[PDB]
Curated annotation (Swiss-Prot), chains A, C:
It comes from the Viruses. Phosphorylated on both serine and threonine residues. Small t antigen inhibits the dephosphorylation by the AC form of PP2A. It is found in: Host nucleus. The sequence shown is that of strain 776. The chain holds residues 134 to 253 of 708 of the full protein. Isoform large T antigen is a key early protein essential for both driving viral replication and inducing cellular transformation. Plays a role in viral genome replication by driving entry of quiescent cells into the cell cycle and by autoregulating the synthesis of viral early mRNA. Displays highly oncogenic activities by corrupting the host cellular checkpoint mechanisms that guard cell division and the transcription, replication, and repair of DNA. Participates in the modulation of cellular gene expression preceeding viral DNA replication. Isoform 17kT antigen targets host RBL2 for degradation and promotes cell proliferation. Transactivates host cyclin A promoter through its J domain. Residues 6-120 bind DNA. Isoform large T antigen forms homohexamers in the presence of ATP. Interacts with host HDAC1. Interacts (via LXCXE domain) with host RB1; the interaction induces the aberrant dissociation of RB1-E2F1 complex thereby disrupting RB1's activity. Interacts (via LXCXE domain) with host pRB-related proteins RBL1 and RBL2. Interacts (via C-terminus) with host TOP1 and POLA1 allowing DNA replication. Interacts with host TP53, inhibiting TP53 binding to DNA. Interacts with host preinitiation complex components TBP, TFIIA and TFIID to regulate transcription initiation. This is Large T antigen. The J domain is essential for multiple viral activities, including virion assembly, viral DNA replication, transformation and transcriptional activation.
Length: 120, 115, 120, 115
DNA sequence: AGAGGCCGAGGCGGCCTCGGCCTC
DNA sequence: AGAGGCCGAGGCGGCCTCGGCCTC
């Protein structure tokens, strides 16, 4: 199981671990099964402005924007409760557009997203 | 099983909404978990006395602690060493009366911390 | 300068130092000068339901109830900013009635309070 | 005084709203504070070079740091070692030009980290 | 150059439950 | 006895600024 996001996405993500800064864009790397579940659970839990689910090297990535700010640790705590026994990596996203755009182009692809035609 | 053997129930605290702490407890669980918990409870709660008993193809642990505890705390500890197996944890109001009953049929002593 | 409240009041006070519990009753031990100032500043800052100022062995004690809960550390942080260079001890009060009543009887006395006739 | 000597002002950054960092600074303060800060700044910021100068009955410190800093950070450090005395901290845009001017009259070198 | 968007470390100040204490 | 008020430790999850980074 992956220990981090794909190398090609790392420059868009926050790697902060000692910060209480809150933000409004997040990504989760997990199994197809757990990402499908979390897609709807995260959408509802955080009233997301946008969420998309993507293929990533036989796993899935969720990408989402929230209407209010959250600590990465909070999003992680939520997601980890619903993913006992499967891998899950949750990070804040700094370069939001670059991350989403990377996620729509090979080797990744969109599985589903909450707004028709995605973001621009 | 969803409760203790029906003939032990009057020895036990039947509290639901109490924050009362006590220093005698009983656990009803599987043979595997009772063997494991006998040792774990002894160390965790520095028990003054612990006994393990046979009870209708399951086991009962009976124990006295040197300090008082909530039933819910003992249960919280025991339950996270039992995430799959069955387990009922109850406080014991009638202490000697519970141990004595657990020493006579249908119950039998498997082991005790004091001979 | 005192290092704690008078011994006779200690059983009414919280001595917690490792807790983030919030409460709604506090006391401050400080100089006459700083207690007079804080009486009005605390009243306003926290919208107190009640505040009283008391003589205590040639210093003053402030006693107050707040309409919302606060960490002792928060009340302390506020009070300490306005008492650079003079002693100030700030504690939560557990036994609110017993504390206030003790504070109205010798060797303590009321200097001023925010409601006529005090509390009962 | 409320600013640097009026003839040094074109050597200095005149930023107010910038988060730009730099690696040359100047401090205008009292003789007592300049003697103290010369040593404190040297150690705190591991300065590559620091000079202390006379300026109209006060002193100027001039320093280069190995890493970049906000003027406000340098000021925050210097100000809390000066809670009573006057102190103006500014970044220096024209580095050699500032040091050279501070070596010629009306200014005089009291001391430099390099001869 | 100066204005200013960004972001990791980390202080601050609420919320909450656990697991004891107590009295009625 | 059981119900339940109380309270210290301490996890949680926002807010904020400092003091760097960057580009326009």
């Amino acid at each position: 199981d992956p220990k981090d996001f794909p190398s090609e996405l790392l420059s868009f993500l926050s790697h902060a671990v000692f910060s209480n800064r809150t933000l409004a864009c997040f990504a989760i790397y997990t199994t197809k099964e757990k990402a499908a579940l979390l897609y709807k659970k995260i959408m509802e839990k955080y009233s997301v402005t946008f969420i998309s689910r993507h293929n990533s090297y036989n796993h899935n990535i969720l990408f989402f924007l929230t209407p209010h700010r959250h600590r990465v640790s909070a999003i992680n705590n939520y997601a980890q409760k619903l993913c006992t026994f499967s891998f899950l990596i949750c990070k804040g996203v700094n370069k939001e557009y670059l991350m989403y755009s990377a996620l729509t182009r090979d080797p990744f692809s969109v599985i589903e997203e909450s707004l028709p035609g995605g973001l621009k």
